Design a protein around this ligand. Sequence first.
Ligand SMILES: Nc1ncnc2c1ncn2[C@@H]1O[C@H](COP(=O)(O)OP(=O)(O)NP(=O)(O)O)[C@@H](O)[C@H]1O
Ligand SMILES: Nc1ncnc2c1ncn2[C@@H]1O[C@H](COP(=O)(O)OP(=O)(O)NP(=O)(O)O)[C@@H](O)[C@H]1O
Ligand SMILES: [Mg+2]
Ligand SMILES: [Mg+2]
Ligand SMILES: [Zn+2]
Ligand SMILES: [Zn+2]
Lengths: 536, 538
Amino acid sequence: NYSSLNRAQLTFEYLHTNSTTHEFLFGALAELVDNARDADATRIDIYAERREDLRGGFMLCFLDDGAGMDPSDAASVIQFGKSAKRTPESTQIGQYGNGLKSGSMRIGKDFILFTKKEDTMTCLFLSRTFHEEEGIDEVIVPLPTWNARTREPVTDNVEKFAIETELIYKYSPFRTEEEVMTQFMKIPGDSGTLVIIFNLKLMDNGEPELDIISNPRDIQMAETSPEGTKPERRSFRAYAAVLYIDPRMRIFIHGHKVQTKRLSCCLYKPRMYKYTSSRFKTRAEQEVKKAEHVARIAEEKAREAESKARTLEVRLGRVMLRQVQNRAITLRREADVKKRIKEAKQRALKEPKELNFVFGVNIEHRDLDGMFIYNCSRLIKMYEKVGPQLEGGMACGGVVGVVDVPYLVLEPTHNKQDFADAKEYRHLLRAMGEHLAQYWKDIAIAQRGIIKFWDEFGYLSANWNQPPSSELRYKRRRAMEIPTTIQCDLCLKWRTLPFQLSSYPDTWVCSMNPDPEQDRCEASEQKQKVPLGTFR
Amino acid sequence: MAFTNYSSLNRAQLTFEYLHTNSTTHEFLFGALAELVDNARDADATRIDIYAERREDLRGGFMLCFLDDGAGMDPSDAASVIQFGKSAKRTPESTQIGQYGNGLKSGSMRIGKDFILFTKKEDTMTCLFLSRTFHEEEGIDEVIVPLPTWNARTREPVTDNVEKFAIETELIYKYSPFRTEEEVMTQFMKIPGDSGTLVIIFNLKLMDNGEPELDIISNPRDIQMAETSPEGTKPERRSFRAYAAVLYIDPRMRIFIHGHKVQTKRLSCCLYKPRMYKYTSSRFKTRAEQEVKKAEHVARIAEEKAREAESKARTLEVRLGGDLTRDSRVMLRQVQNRAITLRREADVKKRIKEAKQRALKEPKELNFVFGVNIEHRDLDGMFIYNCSRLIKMYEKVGPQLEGGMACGGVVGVVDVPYLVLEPTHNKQDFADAKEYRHLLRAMGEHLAQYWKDIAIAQRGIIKFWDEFGYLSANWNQPPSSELRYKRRRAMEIPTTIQCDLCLKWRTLPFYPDTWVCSMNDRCEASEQKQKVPLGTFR
Ligand SMILES: Nc1ncnc2c1ncn2[C@@H]1O[C@H](COP(=O)(O)OP(=O)(O)NP(=O)(O)O)[C@@H](O)[C@H]1O
Ligand SMILES: Nc1ncnc2c1ncn2[C@@H]1O[C@H](COP(=O)(O)OP(=O)(O)NP(=O)(O)O)[C@@H](O)[C@H]1O
Ligand SMILES: [Mg+2]
Ligand SMILES: [Mg+2]
Ligand SMILES: [Zn+2]
Ligand SMILES: [Zn+2]
């Protein structure tokens, strides 16, 4: 029993320390998007609610129709490091038990979250305003729960519940129980979550860092954009569109749909190269050696306990007989379950241990090139130049590369904007650069003449940065090379259209497609067939 | 200042897995080691020894030890180590590097699974033991930390709870590298002064081939990354000896690696024709003004309260003119002493305010220094320090962002105060990207002015580099090693060296172990400052 020993604890200032991980402000917003995706949301709305009395003049709201949280799920939010998603073979993005706290506290001073699941709905209120005004150096968090159907409090301590709600009514944007219930009612289904960040951070001139005015359909960085500034680093609509390699969840900003995309579907002559990863193989082999030791120990424990149970039965020829017998039963089921996981890791070990590099030419935007590196579907690095692109030449200029890296090979840094194992990441970039050179040889556009290739798509200007010509002949020349893809708003499937779109998307559903083969939500989804190239 | 009793409410808590989460901030492994070096400098150490202790029974084969002779920690200071976010350093316009209440924990847990720290101060010695091995083995999901303290002279336990002390020490003997009290005391004996700290990180992380990430074998005087170094690899990204040498803009603390002194340096003193440009910072001035206004308010309130108590002491004394009772005597003394206390406090706040007002009138400028790296022209770009600690190195700006020879070879240095920029969580970037980008743009413009001011076009560029021994066509290749060319570069950059005794920096007119002023020539010849000529921008 360790009850007298010191525990590590979190203090108020740590909320700030943790938030300084996000020098890229959109990567703080991405944490909350990730959480909606991981909760199996089919939709997230990211929108502003104007509030001239709050710092920055609006609250930033994230509303999803995902699985929601029950009261114990909600309470584990403030157990830093706790992540039910951190399970073997987990393909959730969440793993570190931190992102909502680091991201929200980068964006604003305070947040209030509303969540509903089955018959409960819970509010979690993180108010740094409260801690400052009342001199609190711990991190104290109101967490009231109500019954979702009757709106009665669900609490084991009515005095505590009264203090919690009084704090919410005093310090949150919502000053009455009615106003709080109004927020719960914005979650219209049986489950979902609404996260509201408020008292947003200001620049030195008193304006918020997030600009929702310049383009009312977007969330932009409030800073001047130089010449080669990437759209994804100043427009959240642009960043959200490529945040996942395999978008399904629909994203809306200020009520306007984001045209999410699969980068490999947006490129000229996409080709895929399979890269055998020694790291992937070694780590899978070690995860097996470990599972087989874990199953071995459990079996010896179960075998001892069963032996003692049998001997005690014959000796007794009671109460204690069942402590021994059931202990044997439980160790045996423990041993069997670990043997099954050992076997499952052995089976997976035989699968190919390969990373799939995909390359194609960004003919619409030659200057937006380099590698996009995803980690368990989540974008980590964008526009990373490799191989010949690291020279001052036109070789491999315009080429976009995409790869999805599993956690066994790389895990992210604390801010999910870099990779924690720099040595192995640098190795990956060299491997990607070698394959990029092979892609470039393979499509041979440099053997035939690289300037004349770009001329054909209408790059009249001498500066590498300006867009290709917008006259009609060059528009159609470019468009002919890139299929038109679109997601159904009802069934979430990805479709191709046999014509070109005119221009911010509106609602589209399968039955609007003139293609008789994709004409109904019940028609099965066609997969991109990216052709395979060969290294060396 | 709480409205009610909040003891029933939920607190946020730290769990075991967060130690790992926190450590993933350090993708640059040397940045995790730098956290511990920063703590030693902040504790006013005159020396830190970073060394390996071979232990074939522990993961990675050795423990990494950080031994300093700084101010150490008493038991309450040690307990606050594990209050994440708590930092007594976080004070107005601080010149300590620490401010976030995290670096020891993020850095140590990047490097290894476990650490044990020994520290001495005044009459106490304390051990702090962070054992992820213990947590895994016993299934602990909180973060539980043994923190025993002994009397430094008698070695008797200093504790409020002898049962807790026995549990704490037995955890250390079970899970740490030191399995008896005697072995622990041997570690305290390595702190030979009245104060200091020894941090030992062990069960080091391994690469897939089973070897540690840190290579202490290839060069037994260094700590290197166990990785191949391709062509464009900077020394400070592969050699901890190289990194440590430039980690601080104004080195004082001596650094030893495996017992061998690091030749720390001031980058601005290693360059050809250094020039300084002053850049006015509006944020620096605005923020310093707000800090003065806060101190003015604090002083004014304290003066009001002191005058109130002083008035009451005067009027109460007259009201008790004829009164000889013990009651009236004790109550008059109570208010008289309260007036004395508040007057002393008011006079302290006044002095604090007046010091801040005087500091406010100093120029609120950043100092950019530029020079040509004629010894290694490929090692160029900007070195950006923050409260004297290196954050960004080799950052190319201005003309250097083009293809060309313009500003090739130029190194720039700037020390940014905390009022202007603060660092990211891993102290390897800046938290305010917008303002950092503004600073880079300004540095690039001043760089272009520097290149005009030294006017290499006048003598010609090709011939400039040829004269210092760069006859080869390639940019990446080192300059000639002929005697003529070594001396020609040597006349342009005076050799400086630090005295091992007094820590002063001195200049020599023209070794690996030690050097002192009398080898030049006495330690209290006042330290001479290089005057860097002033340029103007536009
Ligand atoms: N939108 C949401 N819907 C449902 N559950 C959520 C949502 N946001 C947060 N959660 C829950 O809150 C927990 C903590 O979230 P967070 O702090 O982001 O850590 P994490 O997602 O588990 N790991 P990471 O994001 O990698 O640090 C999650 O594990 C979920 O259980
Ligand atoms: N070598 C040391 N000598 C003396 N005190 C030390 C030493 N190392 C750590 N400490 C103490 O431990 C505290 C916590 O260290 P740390 O976790 O590094 O946070 P910090 O230094 O205060 N700020 P930061 O490094 O920016 O996160 C410090 O504030 C000191 O009080
Ligand atoms: Mg998360
Ligand atoms: Mg520190
Ligand atoms: Zn459909
Ligand atoms: Zn000296």
